[PDB]
Design a protein around this ligand. Structure first.
Ligand SMILES: NC(=O)c1c[nH]c2ncnc(N[C@H]3CCCC=C3Br)c12
Length: 167
């Protein structure tokens, strides 16, 4: 039993809700919140800009030190950093950005990072400003993640479409 509330169950291990991941993280304080990161951990917009803003820029400060030490992530890769006031940990995951020409096949590799964590609150990777089809992202999520994932979809209109079209 966990504290996630109001989710629709899609499969044995995947759940979905129309919610703002920032407000959801603040309420649940999950062990792991997933950020829709880029390789530079520059949290400017989309989910990343919103999560970083909610940390009063502490996420960005921590991220800049991480990059200065380790260099950029790989597309499809991840790192675990602090969750600040939102969660115990933040799993920064880099899905391919279609608006940069990155290979959509890397979306499966990106979701594989979720399997290192028993339970996660997450957005749909590569959706929104990353330019991929969210219906496809949900399909890859369901077919790749085996741990318990609670997906937050900001747009109410998009949420209804993902549910109604789910196989
Ligand atoms: N500024 C923002 O993009 C968000 C702030 N919180 C969010 N929670 C969920 N998805 C978000 N964005 C996108 C990316 C994922 C696919 C649908 C949507 Br909608 C955001």
């Amino acid at each position: 039993v966990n504290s996630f509330s109001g989710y629709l169950k899609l499969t044995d291990n995947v759940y979905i809700k129309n919610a703002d991941i920032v407000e959801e993280a603040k309420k649940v304080k999950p062990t792991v919140v997933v950020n829709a990161a880029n390789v530079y951990l520059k949290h400017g917009g989309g989910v990343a800009g919103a999560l970083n803003k909610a940390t009063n820029n502490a996420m960005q400060v921590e991220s800049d030190d991480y990059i200065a030490t380790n260099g950029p992530l790989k597309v499809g890769g991840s790192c675990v950093l602090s969750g600040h006031n939102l969660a115990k940990h933040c799993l920064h995951v880099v899905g391919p950005n279609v608006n940069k020409g990155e290979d959509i096949q890397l979306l499966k590799s990106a979701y594989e990072n979720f399997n290192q964590h028993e339970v996660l609150l997450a957005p749909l990777l590569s959706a929104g400003i990353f330019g991929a089809d969210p219906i496809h992202s949900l399909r890859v999520c369901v077919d790749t993640v085996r741990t318990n994932v609670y997906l937050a979809v900001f747009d109410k209109n998009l949420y209804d479409k993902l549910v109604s079209s789910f196989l």
